């Protein structure tokens, strides 16, 4: 049987890396467990609770990829189509060459399209600004390719913002409509939301979220933050339950059929103790013991998340912290070691 004390301990100690609070939930064999420590609110000291909603950030990428893959299954697009066929005139200038960029590459971050958040016109700490997706694309291509398509790996939100546009070009429906109609509604993910450019986290069932760019400063409350800077790369809100159910269905063969799931799990090297091997909106975290955890993290102001699971979908975890602490980018490593070892 699992030693849950070691998980509790690892959950609790994560706070000492400089976070207000933490929630996690695990499912294994259909046996669930819930964890929470620390506080939802640094000023009132109200406790973190396990069933809270949170901004999942880049875990959104896995939902977007899943839609793109269903579209491939239905013969509405091909992973190796060039994007020039779908979105001509978009990725150009600066030596970009769209005729060599494929849909597959956007999905696994090998396109070389530059990351819009490196632009000087981008400000993470602006908690208000509404961006249209095409503005983020243009911001990204304002900088030259990092490399030639397919020749290297580099994390690019720009590519996932582009994919959200693509989806709509393919079906006539917004990426949010597609995520809602294909994933949220059929899995009954009843605490999972696509907020657009609204800054609201709905309801009272969530914590305050914080950001701390520093260590030598107060964390700032950024609970209300405009998620349109993330779009189809990072805007979603969800819960530990809904994310467990999602990853368990995905990895257990219930959302993507075998042929598409195999493509999703075909990975490229990242070169990076950071992520491991990266697939289509999902990556492999390999533990010392030989265990592979497939899932994704997120990190958006207010909230740092990881969700994921074992191949076959029978063991998953989701975890969230309510602050973005730039000094501790990789906080979940011991939780995973406890929950998935041995």
Numbering used by the authors: 17 to 358
Task: Give the published text.
In this study, we used alkaline D-peptidase from Bacillus cereus DF4-B (ADP), an AmpH-type class C PBP141516, as a model for determining the peptide ligand recognition mechanism of PBPs. ADP also catalyzes synthesis of peptides: for example, it can synthesize D-Phe oligopeptides from D-phenylalanine methyl ester. This tetrad is also present in ADP (Ser74/Tyr171/His312/Lys77).
The space group is P3221, and one ADP molecule is present in each asymmetric unit. The crystal structure of ADP consists of two subdomains: a five-stranded β-sheet flanked by three α-helices, and a cluster of mixed 310-helices and α-helices. A cavity for binding substrate peptides is also present near the active-site residues. Two regions, the Ω loop and the 283–293 loop (red circle), had higher B-factor values than the average value for the structure overall (32.2 Å2): the values for Ω loop and 283–293 loop are 73.9 and 56.7 Å2, respectively. Therefore, in this study, the ADP structure was compared with DD-peptidase. Three regions, the 132–144 loop, Ω loop, and 283–293 loop, have different conformations in the two proteins. In particular, the structure of the 132–144 loop of ADP is clearly different from that of DD-peptidase: in ADP, this region consists of 13 amino acids and has a loop structure (green), whereas in DD-peptidase it consists of 18 amino acids and contains a helix-turn-helix motif (orange). Trp233 of DD-peptidase, which creates a small hydrophobic space required for accommodating a part of the side chain of D-Ala (P1) of the substrate (glycyl-L-α-amino-ε-pimelyl-D-Ala-D-Ala [REX]), is replaced by Met245 in ADP; this replacement creates the hydrophobic space required to accommodate a part of the D-Phe (P1) side chain of the ADP substrate. Initially, ADP forms a closed state in which the 132–144 and Ω loops interact.
